[PDB]
Amino acid sequence: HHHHHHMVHITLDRNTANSWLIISKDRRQVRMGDTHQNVSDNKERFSNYPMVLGAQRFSSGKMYWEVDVTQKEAWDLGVCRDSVQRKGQFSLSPENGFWTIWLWQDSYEAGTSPQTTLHIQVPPCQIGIFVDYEAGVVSFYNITDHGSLIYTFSECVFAGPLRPFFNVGFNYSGGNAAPLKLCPL
Ligand SMILES: CC(C)N1CCN(C(=O)c2cccs2)CC1
Numbered sequence: 049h050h051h052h053h054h055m056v057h058i059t060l061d062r063n064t065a066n067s068w069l070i071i072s073k074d075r076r077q078v079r080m081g082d083t084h085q086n087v088s089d090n091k092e093r094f095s096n097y098p099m100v101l102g103a104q105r106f107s108s109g110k111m112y113w114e115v116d117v118t119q120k121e122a123w124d125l126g127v128c129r130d131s132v133q134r135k136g137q138f139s140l141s142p143e144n145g146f147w148t149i150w151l152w153q154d155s156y157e158a159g160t161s162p163q164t165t166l167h168i169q170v171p172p173c174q175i176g177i178f179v180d181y182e183a184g185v186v187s188f189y190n191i192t193d194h195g196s197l198i199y200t201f202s203e204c205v206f207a208g209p210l211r212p213f214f215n216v217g218f219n220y221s222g223g224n225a226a227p228l229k230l231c232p233l
Contacts, residue, residue, distance in 0.1 A: 055112050058113045060103065066093060068081045069098060096135075111181075115175050116229035129207065141159060145208070184205070185204065216228055
């Protein structure tokens with residue numbers, strides 16, 4: 049892929065974070081805390097899952113960013129509508145406003161409904177995410193494997209501004225404490 053030149057600087061929006069997340073001073077890293085992080089509740093926060101949005105909103109053009117997932121057992125990454133549901137239980141699907149992939153129990157899957165098995169030969173340590181708003185495309189790239197394609201959502205119906213989307217996952221096992229990190233340009 050030759051998408052690197054649409055690189056955008058993403059930062060995390062603290063106000064949207066689940067109340068157990070810890071976001072670094074530079075707003076470029078997030079991890080699961082071992083308790084409530086002593087913040088007030090608000091209508092933006094994801095209540096049920098360890099999710100957070102990027103601050104940036106995109107309604108046109110081409111955008112690219114990279115995320116470090118080193119040594120995590122579980123995570124979701126992609127984009128979502130600015131208007132997605134924050135409270136209660138929901139599935140990651142395009143019908144609900146999400147264009148995502150994930151790692152869960154040693155399998156990588158795309159968030160179609162129902163979900164799609166991904167065929168990854170080299171477990172990724174960094175993921176590239178490309179959005180073409182006008183074309184209706186979200187693509188995922190394996191930066192560890194020379195940028196190989198992971199998955200393309202095409203014919204996307206965004207139906208609103210898009211935000212970068214992250215889920216650090218639960219840490220029931222004690223093996224998933226590591227952060228998601230936004231990688232330097
Ligand atoms: C890895 C983990 C943090 N993900 C939580 C959110 N998630 C879903 O909502 C779905 C699962 C099956 C259909 S949708 C995908 C898995």
